[PDB]
């Protein structure tokens, strides 16, 4: 929800897309970010819709990826699950 955590989620999106399509995208930066959050007491579900710039052929191009991140914690433990939901130009 801050620019450091968004930077890491964007690098996650680009890396996972690269591994999913055998692409070789060079992450440049995150231009815009939109998020949907549910913040139930002791839980945080988040769908991140990040529009970032990455250079596919060496020249920058613009892609929007949506990464799902669910932070579930209970009295003894916490889970942090994240999942790349979509990558698209």
């Amino acid at each position: 929800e801050n620019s450091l955590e968004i930077e890491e989620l964007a690098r996650f999106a680009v890396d996972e897309h690269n591994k999913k399509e055998n692409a070789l995208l060079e992450f440049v930066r995150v231009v815009k970010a939109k998020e949907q959050i549910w913040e139930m007491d002791a839980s945080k579900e988040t769908m991140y819709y990040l529009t970032l710039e990455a250079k596919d052929g060496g020249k920058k191009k613009l892609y929007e990826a949506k990464v799902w991140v669910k932070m579930t914690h209970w009295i003894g433990a916490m889970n942090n699950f994240k999942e790349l939901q979509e990558f698209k130009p």
């Binding site: 007491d41 002791a42 579900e45 669910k70 579930t72 914690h73 209970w74 009295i75 889970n79 999942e83």
Partner: protein, 74 residues
């Protein structure tokens, strides 16, 4: 009332229950709808493991509340 049951990954189902109903009955509903036996269901709410003997109102599980479900694999 209607409540939600989610897993650690965010998969969600919705069950119609009453605050008089017991956690055993809720787990039986999860068995009927999704097919997971109640002996495998470890239900979580308000940062607590739920005991099959107590009711939803005991744990202050109001309407439209969301629980989380972790598999036990007994």
């Amino acid at each position: 009332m209607q409540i939600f049951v989610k897993t650690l990954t965010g998969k969600t189902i919705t069950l119609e229950v009453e605050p008089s109903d017991t956690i055993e009955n809720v787990k039986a509903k999860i068995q009927d709808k999704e097919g997971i036996p109640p002996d495998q269901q470890r239900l979580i709410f308000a940062g607590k493991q739920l005991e099959d003997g107590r009711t939803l109102s005991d744990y202050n599980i109001q309407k439209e509340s969301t629980l989380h479900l972790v598999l036990r694999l007994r």
